[PDB]
Amino acid sequence: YMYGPGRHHLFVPGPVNIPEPVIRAMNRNNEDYRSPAIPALTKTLLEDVKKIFKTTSGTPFLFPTTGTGAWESALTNTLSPGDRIVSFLIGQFSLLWIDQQKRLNFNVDVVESDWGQGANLQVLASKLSQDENHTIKAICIVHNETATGVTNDISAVRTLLDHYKHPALLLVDGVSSICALDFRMDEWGVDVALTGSQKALSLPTGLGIVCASPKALEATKTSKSLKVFFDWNDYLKFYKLGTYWPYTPSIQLLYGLRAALDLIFEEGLENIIARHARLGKATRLAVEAWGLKNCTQKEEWISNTVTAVMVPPHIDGSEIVRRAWQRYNLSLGLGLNKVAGKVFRIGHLGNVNELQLLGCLAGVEMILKDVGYPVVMGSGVAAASTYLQHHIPLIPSRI
Amino acid sequence: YMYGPGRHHLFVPGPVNIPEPVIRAMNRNNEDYRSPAIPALTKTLLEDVKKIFKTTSGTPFLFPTTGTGAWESALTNTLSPGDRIVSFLIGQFSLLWIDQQKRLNFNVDVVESDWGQGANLQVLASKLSQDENHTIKAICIVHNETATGVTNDISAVRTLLDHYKHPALLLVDGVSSICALDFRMDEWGVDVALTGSQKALSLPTGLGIVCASPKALEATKTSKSLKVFFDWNDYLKFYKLGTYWPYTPSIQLLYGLRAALDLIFEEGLENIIARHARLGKATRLAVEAWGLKNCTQKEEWISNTVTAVMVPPHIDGSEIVRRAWQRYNLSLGLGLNKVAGKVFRIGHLGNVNELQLLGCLAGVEMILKDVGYPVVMGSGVAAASTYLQHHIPLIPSRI
Amino acid sequence: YMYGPGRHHLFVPGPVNIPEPVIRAMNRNNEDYRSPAIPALTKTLLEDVKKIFKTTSGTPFLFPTTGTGAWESALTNTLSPGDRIVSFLIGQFSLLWIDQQKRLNFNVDVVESDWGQGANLQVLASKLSQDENHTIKAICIVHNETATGVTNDISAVRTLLDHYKHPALLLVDGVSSICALDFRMDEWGVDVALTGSQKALSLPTGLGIVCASPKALEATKTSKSLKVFFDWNDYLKFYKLGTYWPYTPSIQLLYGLRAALDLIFEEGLENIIARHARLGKATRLAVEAWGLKNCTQKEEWISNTVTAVMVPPHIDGSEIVRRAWQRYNLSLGLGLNKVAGKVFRIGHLGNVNELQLLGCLAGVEMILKDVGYPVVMGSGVAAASTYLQHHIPLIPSRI
Amino acid sequence: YMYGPGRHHLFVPGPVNIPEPVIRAMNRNNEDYRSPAIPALTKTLLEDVKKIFKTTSGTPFLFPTTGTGAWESALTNTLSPGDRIVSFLIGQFSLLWIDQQKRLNFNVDVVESDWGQGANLQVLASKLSQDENHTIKAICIVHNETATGVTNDISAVRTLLDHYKHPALLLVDGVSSICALDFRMDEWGVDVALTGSQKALSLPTGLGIVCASPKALEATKTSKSLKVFFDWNDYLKFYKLGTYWPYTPSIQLLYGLRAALDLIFEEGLENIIARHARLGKATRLAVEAWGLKNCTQKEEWISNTVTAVMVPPHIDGSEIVRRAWQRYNLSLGLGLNKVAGKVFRIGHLGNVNELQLLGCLAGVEMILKDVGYPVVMGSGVAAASTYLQHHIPLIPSRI
Ligand SMILES: Cc1ncc(COP(=O)(O)O)c(C=O)c1O
Ligand SMILES: Cc1ncc(COP(=O)(O)O)c(C=O)c1O
Ligand SMILES: Cc1ncc(COP(=O)(O)O)c(C=O)c1O
Ligand SMILES: Cc1ncc(COP(=O)(O)O)c(C=O)c1O
């Protein structure tokens, strides 16, 4: 281990902090997954998970995998090799999903934007209006691009598909959005939505949570992609049998998810969404007070789960990250690929409160001084805390 | 929860009991997987994992998946669709691997044996001697068939491949054997060996541990199967970069594996193998004293990780399992598919000692009476404990 | 630290096995004991603790101490130096309490019996009959002598006090009885009852739980023993203030006690008492099958929380304890003081089930063979199992 | 129980934050305290505890008690009723110790100062000069008064005792100093030093750690105070027997203390003292920037483990504590007794780092605005950060 004094400040956008009640719930020996207790628990998880996607008709699947594995399940259950997909390259994780799509032998129409911009829906509109024969089988879009702090407008994608009477499936990566930003599966007509357990759900890595619409389930009948581990049909077979698991799940993660959902419902999903909004706004006010720039190029794309901070050209963003780890016991997110060295990222998602964030922001001011950037000490902390003092609600449990 | 008094007796062959030191090691918040601590830890895990496979030249991969996902990785990295495989159907898990092989569009030559028998190597010999053009690309064989308690002789498979000068790859499922039975990857010339974390390693579910020979790595160059999540090449890319992880791992499971390996090395792999042998022998002596039958039909196939007990035709093995759970707080393994109702299974693998086993065996005697089978109370416990009293070693830490 | 394979079998009569939900509850950071949460939790603990003493009139105190500290609190709050007490020396822990009584300058009338016998009540009657001037201020009696497996009849003590119309206080050590044997504080007119957390409550050491009748509280007014840390009046002061704690408690033990009481009420106290009666009878049956002798000399004094086993002259009881630790990963109780080397102890209390005990008993058979006693293997297990197969109830949570 | 989002900010001066490796170490079932493992562990604890007291001659005792119980042990082992003691009343905890001294029938010479001042050493000198017949048997002095943030100079007390050639014993409460401020038991000639586990050691409540000089041990021979639970002689008896425990310890706290001492030695005691000096100075700088006043009246008495902050007349200090709990998920210390409503306390001790403190300080700024104090947001954070950016050392484990 590389011990440092006090509690480590985890401000990467995934993995995130795990609440103590959830750590306690996972503190347990293994159990027999074919015992009656594990199906009974699973049944309550499947029902409650629908609530965080805001679906009544969707079917969830709890894969023992990561977000990348959930991606793969969404594609191989609904599509066949050679099928045409439209996807939006706006940063590193949208890029990696497109890399996966190409490697699974789909025909990807790539719509590129500069990093810090959102998906180009004008190009989408143009592609849909020209696609009279309905060759585009799916739209694959990242809701929140974790590399750049850009949130896309999923409802506008649905507006366009309906406008053109176009039957393409809508597959949405909500890995860094679900349970932090608003997500409305049924209202937006999302056919496959996915998230990972180590993001806003505030768990260890290891669940890739997939939720499919009736339309996506219908599509599996014609899907000629190959799948076994990620095949929805095996799960559906075991759902009907009442045992739920075609192979072994993580007992610990199932009890942990139970506790995580209980905390989410106790705080209240809409209160969680408002909490992320306050923390994102607070962070963006601090970045402006420092004189630095948000990577996000227009206010319509702001992300309340991550802020990608751009640094002047003589400052190395990856040196900020290194100094945070070595001196301040603080984990910040690296700039990736195209924005390597030009940004660092402040994650603000999952189970984190305002004083935690303010401690991070104060550390960043010291790091900036350490690398020779002339910040006025306290100016960002003061901008965040002046805003937060107006809006922090009282904790209802304490009256 | 379905609470019962005292400690639950977990005697299914996976998941198994987790030692307390490993539970403690996993009792932790998330950490940044791109921090320097996680690569440094990973490097020591990859080195030590080679020791439990007994390989010096093999390359390990720590997938966040289950044993079924490790299966899929072994096939899709080394083979192409349409390739001819020989595999051995001797029970439920060998059957499920063949189901997977067929579903990934390989041409499977299935060699069937009755449940309770081992792989038919005479048929193998015949297929190899006829295969002058080397159309068989791989042999896929389960080392220990968890459904029936049958262990196959992997060295004999290698003897035959070399005898016929035959270049087929050797893929071995050691899910219920590695770190309990002897496994000699390099001496046996295994090209892909795999295990799961929830078996003898004594962890939660969630790691599918794959170890590949240089020959298997060479084969990825010609593999035209599709893979992304399970693609070895992405791991190898990140191994060379020194960060190791192409996507997020489970932080908790990495520290837990560190603690599990430390305990394995402290007890000593050969002492662990001898401990499983004592417990299996003890169990088989008890079954004979009860007047029941081992499913395993010949002594050459006995399994020191699981004993499948056959019950007379008027006794329902699944009623034994149910009664264990409802009255004795004891988890026993169900008969599966073909042996449903005709067997129940006593798992004896992972971190379990002799008094734990004897408590299970005494419970089974009471259950047998409960269902009207005329056991002589104490006869199986006495047969096991008479044998064990000769062979239990002193605990070295206590002198 | 001195690792052995598998789970350690803890069969000493204190500390006992901690249920896993209680381990989870205690898995937490410190909290501010002056914050509103700790008084609110404490109030519920005080109410529910009364139910395990079976009192409605009594006042409980949760001292951060051990059983010996609860002893000391019991004495110094109700008595003055020079006060005459009657106490019963029947074993090591009744002896230690008398040693403490003498060192606190009380005038102790010691009624002695051989180890393996109960309190001599005909001597008590004679003392009460002769004490016309009520110089006897208290009877101090151990309910269950953990060193010998002897349980005294507290109801019979009250009968004698009432028969002679004698006002003495009745102080009762129930450290190894309460929440395992029946205990009726009000029905028996017990004035001070005490237990410790690491016994049948199944917690860590660290709470000395004292419960006082209104008569005992009146006695504090005239008690001139010196006390501060153990003074009930400081607790009562803070009870009235609403904050409950005159100095810092263990946060972890308070939450642990909440969880332990919840498990007790879920199983049901009467069911817990029944479960201890099964375990005790099964152990005594095994001892009889082995041809060994119970230390306890009459049936009326049998203890359902501990069995002290007498060994023949060529056997050293300490060697049995040593062998259990070194070979079998089993903890058994030593013979103490007068019975050192002549006995060993099997503890059967707190959260333990029948298959755990049977594993212990099977292990003891092997140890007896090791040290040269001609036991018939299986004979004690068979006697215990025959009995238990008729009496173990179904687990109500599992239907 | 009263859940709030994110991690709770624990800034009371006891209980303090527990490091995660210590939480993990304590996450364990009970064990037999008479088994060979617990004496072997205890011996290492006794040796290493001496290093935190900076003694080679002293004998430590690990009582299962709180700080108040360590007080009581200190007094009753070295003094007799009627013995004259000199003690210094400067705050709530020095007052409680005097209250205990009087209730144990000692003749207490009370030297009083205003809250916010240190011990009046010129009065002590005058007392020592006048005590020709050495009737003063001991000086009892709190090293750090946790109620006011005042640290006394123990070296100056020893200087006066030696100047007047006076033999009195020197008993020192270091409950909120040891392992945070410097403490030199032998160099200062301290005869009894005591601390509690839930302070800078960063454990749960439940150990009262007492360390006695050879002179204090000689004093037990003539001490006629009554004691059993707290009697050092019973410990010394069991030290010589090799088993160390006269009654049952907390297993979890022993392993927890092992892990806590390991963390202390890894960071380095001198580095821990430096870290507390940084935290204290940063807090006092923030207080000065806010325009508030330190309760401590002279620089020589400043405390690096707690800062008591005085608020203006229109502000109720208790309202600040309440608001911190209800809105900000922050625990701060109440003003006690004489300074109730006039002060609040910021605890800065044990395992806490600079970004944790800065989060607290930023939160206090918001609370001051809430309750109507015209703070300049960022002003205290900026003062603390400017100072800390020059002094935080690099974490040696991370290079
Ligand atoms: C939006 C998004 N999708 C997918 C991924 C990949 O998820 P994982 O690392 O769990 O495979 C990430 C990275 O965490 C992400 O941020
Ligand atoms: C030999 C064998 N291989 C593979 C599997 C499948 O493993 P998992 O359930 O982790 O997917 C099992 C079942 O546990 C097994 O026993
Ligand atoms: C009946 C009885 N009373 C008192 C004690 C002393 O308890 P402790 O070891 O908690 O101080 C014991 C020992 O556990 C005991 O068995
Ligand atoms: C200096 C000092 N001494 C003694 C005590 C009493 O300690 P406890 O609450 O552990 O009994 C305290 C309070 O924590 C204290 O601060």
Side-chain angles (χ1 to χ4, degrees), chain A residues 33 229 247-248, chain B residues 13-14 66-69 71 93 142 144-146 173-176 194 196 198-199 205:
Chain A
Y33 84 99
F229 180 85
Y247 46 71
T248 315
Chain B
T66 75
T68 301
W71 279 345
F93 299 103
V142 177
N144 187 80
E145 166 62 72
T146 322
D173 169 333
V175 165
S176 60
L194 52 90
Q198 80 274 26
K199 304 282 166 144
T205 306

Side-chain angles (χ1 to χ4, degrees), chain D residues 192-265:
Chain D
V192 187
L194 60 107
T195 192
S197 52
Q198 77 278 23
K199 305 284 174 141
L201 280 162
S202 291
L203 286 154
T205 312
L207 297 175
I209 300 153
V210 181
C211 198
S213 67
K215 178 166 148 166
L217 293 176
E218 276 292 304
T220 66
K221 306 213 186 321
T222 52
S223 164
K224 261 76 165 216
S225 291
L226 305 185
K227 65 277 195 170
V228 177
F229 183 76
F230 289 125
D231 191 342
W232 298 345
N233 283 137
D234 289 337
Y235 282 73
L236 292 168
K237 179 172 108 157
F238 279 80
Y239 291 8
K240 180 166 158 190
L241 295 187
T243 53
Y244 293 95
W245 291 104
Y247 45 73
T248 318
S250 171
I251 300 301
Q252 289 75 20
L253 279 180
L254 297 187
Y255 285 97
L257 179 57
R258 180 68 268 163
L261 293 172
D262 289 350
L263 288 181
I264 287 161
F265 298 136

Side-chain angles (χ1 to χ4, degrees), chain C residues 256-321:
Chain C
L257 179 57
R258 180 68 268 163
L261 293 172
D262 289 350
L263 288 181
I264 287 161
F265 298 136
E266 183 143 85
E267 183 175 357
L269 187 54
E270 298 311 300
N271 296 318
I272 290 167
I273 291 162
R275 171 164 53 78
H276 280 84
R278 291 195 302 274
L279 300 173
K281 167 84 155 188
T283 301
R284 293 187 291 279
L285 284 178
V287 165
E288 176 177 32
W290 299 336
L292 300 173
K293 293 226 278 235
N294 194 351
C295 185
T296 301
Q297 295 189 6
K298 293 167 71 105
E299 259 138 15
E300 71 197 70
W301 295 322
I302 58 193
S303 170
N304 285 332
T305 59
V306 53
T307 299
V309 188
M310 307 229 305
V311 295
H314 67 290
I315 302 299
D316 179 342
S318 303
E319 179 176 350
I320 284 161
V321 171

Side-chain angles (χ1 to χ4, degrees), chain A residues 2 10 12 14-18 23 27-37 40 64-66 68-69 72 93 100 103-105 198 203-205 226-231 234 247-252 325 331-332 334 336 345, chain B residues 2 10 12 14-18 23 27-37 40 64-66 68-69 72 93 100 103-105 198 203-205 226-231 234 247-252 325 331-332 334 336 345:
Chain A
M2 298 174 175
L10 186 68
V12 294
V16 305
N17 292 285
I18 301 176
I23 288 174
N27 182 46
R28 69 180 54 242
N29 196 16
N30 279 326
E31 304 165 18
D32 175 20
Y33 84 99
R34 298 194 178 104
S35 73
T65 193
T66 75
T68 301
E72 194 158 319
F93 299 103
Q100 178 181 66
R103 284 211 243 167
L104 299 174
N105 282 8
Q198 80 274 26
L203 289 154
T205 306
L226 305 185
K227 58 276 190 175
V228 172
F229 180 85
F230 290 125
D231 196 332
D234 291 341
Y247 46 71
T248 315
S250 173
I251 297 302
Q252 291 76 17
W325 167 260
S331 273
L332 297 170
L334 281 165
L336 298 176
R345 292 179 291 152
Chain B
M2 298 174 175
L10 186 68
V12 294
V16 305
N17 292 285
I18 301 176
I23 288 174
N27 182 46
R28 69 180 54 242
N29 196 16
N30 279 326
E31 304 165 18
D32 175 20
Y33 84 99
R34 298 194 178 104
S35 73
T65 193
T66 75
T68 301
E72 194 158 319
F93 299 103
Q100 178 181 66
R103 284 211 243 167
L104 299 174
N105 282 8
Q198 80 274 26
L203 289 154
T205 306
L226 305 185
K227 58 276 190 175
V228 172
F229 180 85
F230 290 125
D231 196 332
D234 291 341
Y247 46 71
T248 315
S250 173
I251 297 302
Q252 291 76 17
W325 167 260
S331 273
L332 297 170
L334 281 165
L336 298 176
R345 292 179 291 152

